[PDB]
Amino acid sequence: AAASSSLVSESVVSLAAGTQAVLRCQSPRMVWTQDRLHDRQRVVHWDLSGGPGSQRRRLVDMYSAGEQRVYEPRDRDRLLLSPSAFHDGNFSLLIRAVDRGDEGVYTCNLHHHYCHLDESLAVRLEVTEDPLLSRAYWDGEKEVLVVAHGAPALMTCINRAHVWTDAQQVVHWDRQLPGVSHDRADRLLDLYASGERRAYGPPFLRDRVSVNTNAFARGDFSLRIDELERADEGIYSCHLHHHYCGLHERRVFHLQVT
């Protein structure tokens, strides 16, 4: 709803004059050719509330590779997920026949290991012996499912966002001179995944700054300053926005030249 997701890494760097500075900026999000299989690993798992005060229990999970997995041998074919869950975004859990051992607070949990996104939804399941009392209600914090004993139950969990169901990237380097605030940061470089570099600085610094473009393929956009003068003191920032993930990734370096 705003600058929605950021991964910020801040560091302090103090190096001697004349030494070479290496500001590491590497991320799986910075690998341009994104593997539709391994750079898109999602997982959904349904957990059941534990005992009085500890240790929730995992019931079933499934990765975007497929083939859902049940942990208890009693629930091997009575707890079912949609095999197409990651195609249409329907992560609902189906119980063939609920018993009183299924009562409790369920959570439907989503994890995007590549985008670092977590989602969780709570549904409480109540077992009644009078089938006329079956109902669902209240969403004041969560919805409650009153299910007749022995009957099948479908606990709904939907998320049709594109990140869960299935583009040139640019990495920017900024610098803040001592005394300058954050919003007055001057651009230093634009690094394109295909190798292009756009220089902004004054040639008094531009001579000693360099990057290794051959390492862009593995998502490495690190900065290198060779002959460290005191004029290099400042706050260096490496920022990237990943459109598919909706994610800002930012690395901050407080550089100091002794």
Strands 186-192 and 197-199: antiparallel
Please report, as a single letter, which amino acid is at residue 20.
Q
Cα gap 193→187, rounded to integer Å: 18
Cα gap 251→256, rounded to integer Å: 16
Q: Spell 60-74 as b/e; 16+ CB within 10 A means b.
A: bbbbbeeebebeeee
Cα gap 146→5, rounded to integer Å: 36
Determination technique used: X-ray
Q: What are phi and psi of 173, to 5 degrees?
A: -115, 130
Which stretches does DSSP call E strand in 52-176?
57-63, 66-70, 79-81, 93-95, 104-112, 117-128, 135-137, 143-148, 153-155, 170-176
Q: Spell 136-165 as b/e; 16+ CB within 10 A means b.
A: beeeeeeebbbbbeeeebebebebeeebbb
Question: Residue 3 contacts by C-beta under 8 Å, 6 or more apart in sequence?
Answer: 248
H helices present in the chain, as ranges: 85-88, 162-165, 203-206
Of all residues in the chain, what percent are helix, strand and coil, respectively (each to 5)?
15, 45, 40
Give the three-class secondary structure for 48: strand
Resolution (A): 2.4
Query: Residue 70's Cα: distance from chain center in Å?
Result: 25
Cα gap 166→192, rounded to integer Å: 25
Question: What separation in angstroms does the CA of 176 have from each of 10, 124, 180, 210?
Answer: 14, 51, 6, 18
Whether residue 258 contacts residue 17, with contact meaning beta carbons closer than 8 Å, is answered with yes
Q: Which of 202, 172, 197, 177 is nearest to 187 (CA)?
A: 172
What sign does the dihedral 143-147-150-154 (CA atoms) show? negative
Cα gap 71→78, rounded to integer Å: 12
Count CB-CB contacts under 10 A for residue 4.
10
Count CB-CB contacts under 10 A for residue 87.
12
